[PDB]
Nucleic acid binder design. Sequence first.
DNA 1: CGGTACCCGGGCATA
DNA 2: TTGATTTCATAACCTATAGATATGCCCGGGTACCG
RNA 3: UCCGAGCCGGUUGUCGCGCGGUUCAAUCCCUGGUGCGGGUGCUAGUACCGGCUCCGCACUAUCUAUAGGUUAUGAAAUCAA
Length: 600
Amino acid sequence: PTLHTCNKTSFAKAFLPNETYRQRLLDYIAIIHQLADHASHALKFYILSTSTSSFPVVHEDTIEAILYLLNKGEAWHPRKEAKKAWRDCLLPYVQRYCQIVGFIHPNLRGEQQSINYLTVSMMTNLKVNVQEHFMQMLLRYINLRFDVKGQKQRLPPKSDARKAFFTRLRYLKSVFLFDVVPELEFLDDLTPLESEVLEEIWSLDLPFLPNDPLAYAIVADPMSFFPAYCKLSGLYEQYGFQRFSAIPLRRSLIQSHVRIDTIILYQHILCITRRDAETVEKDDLWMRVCNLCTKAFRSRCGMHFEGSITTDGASVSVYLKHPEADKYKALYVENNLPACRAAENVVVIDPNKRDILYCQDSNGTTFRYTANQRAVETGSRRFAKRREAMKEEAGVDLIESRIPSHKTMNLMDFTRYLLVRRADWDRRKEFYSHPAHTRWKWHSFINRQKSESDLISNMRNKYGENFTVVMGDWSDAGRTARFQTSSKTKGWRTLFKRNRIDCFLLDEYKTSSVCPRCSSSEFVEKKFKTRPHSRPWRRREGKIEKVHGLLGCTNPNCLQQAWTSGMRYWNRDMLSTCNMLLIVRSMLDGHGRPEVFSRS
DNA sequence: CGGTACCCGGGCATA
DNA sequence: TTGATTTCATAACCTATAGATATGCCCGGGTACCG
RNA sequence: UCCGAGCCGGUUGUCGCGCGGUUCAAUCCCUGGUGCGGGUGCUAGUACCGGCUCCGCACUAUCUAUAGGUUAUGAAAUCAA
Ligand SMILES: [Mg+2]
Ligand SMILES: [Mg+2]
Ligand SMILES: [Zn+2]
């Protein structure tokens, strides 16, 4: 739904200073964490075990049955007919998995509430993974087998006659993907290399829709594509391609957040009979453990604190549930011109990798937010070196790095991964049991939250209390270019909304190749200065980096007789912002986007 | 000392 | 003698998806009652 | 495999400028922010109220898990003996 909000808080403030209640929380979280970790591995183990027959269909009952068997073994006595069949089917494999990993049944009481949350959560991961990444992996497999990486050199670009492969590839993809029915005569033109691809893709047993393409079939029923998706991963390992985790695994040993609701509260925390809870108000139960008077539990926007929290022993996530909720190009500046004209001040931002934000007003005031500032303010860089030092001090790297790949689909290979993981499981848990690992995640949230708040506060001082942000449309929806650090591009579109700041998108086409002072894209030079590589390890290699953020104009109008360089130097980020002001100003004035910056 | 019926709590179902 | 290219493990940052609890009924085991 | 930000110049609205100078500001523990007050604290300018620091209270902040890409660390394989 879309009627919930969360106010994260620390463990100390969330829970009252009661040692008995606090100890149960940590003990309960650890038990649930183990079940979630082993259940995911158990789910994959069952799938791999049956790989030599019809693929087993995975439903909510399948994951739920595994969780109960691990916790209760044979003591689980479901009455649903469907669950009974899965219990017997999964029982031989669950016991076998425990032998490999040495798991011992905790026999936790009142598992149902935790089981249901984990069951849905684990089931969600399968749906999400198949829905989005199924198309990406299948398309990648077609490209890899055709050596599209090497086709760049074999068929050099900038030639018309060499588009045959690209045209050939596009036609084959439609036929292979079954989106378009091929001509029956085309089968005689298949090359031996392409012939194998057609048969291999057919073996995936990809579903079909009589009137819709795969783009809609996957969304309609992602679970139907799960059996094909698992076999697709096997093909990647069969030819050395970069493997992907088709079956999600909760590998991390750090205590994960485990949801604690009203029922779990009396079941395990308060340890009182169900009658004691049924006869007492829901708010009263939580007040005995959690300090509801704190800021985190306060209501907001008509959303009250219905009992639900996820904690990991260092931080607590307090959720607010709206009463009306179930009990259980529109963002571009072009289409929002009427609102922009009413803005007190308009700010244009050109995101980049290093200069994550570079803002400029109509008056020319300059402000920027750099990734280095996040590295210091957020503390991620500090938490990086220190994390490595602890790993080296405890000698976990010597053990952690040798773990066999978990993405393998072969049963024998996966068995080795479990054995190696068990080989040094005891040592690693002691290392990850340190409070620092969970402390860093909570501290990162505070520093990251504090850094974002400071960013908005600084912008308000320079740009006023209320302002409208017109950011460039460029953004990385994942798949960030290699050799470049991660950066926040689409996230800023959400941060402004949380702070009651309107955000709009603008096209950046040709915005970096126009001199604002003469409005001409002809006399512009790019990447003329050179110097040793700024990266210390690349500099030792002797590499030379051509300047990227420096631009200049050779037009006589911009030059002066007293100069010796012969160019009016400009900054890439600042130059882009200046062009945006001209583009935005023209559109606001009714003249539209200038032809200089148009895709003509 | 030896059999029967009512109630409490844990478990499981499913919207 | 020496250094260049692929894959994998553990953290993180963004980025995209989905779900973001509760009431009713079974049963079995402990007890109270009767001879 | 290492870096904070603003400003005065070398600049002309110039560069991961490992160019100079200059001011703050984070180095651990902390959920952040807007405002309407009073007070068990410490700070600078000519008693007034510029700075952090607390409660008490209206509103304002979605997060967990998984996965793709990427970054840091640690490992495996090949080509010339
Ligand atoms: Mg841009
Ligand atoms: Mg830029
Ligand atoms: Zn010019």
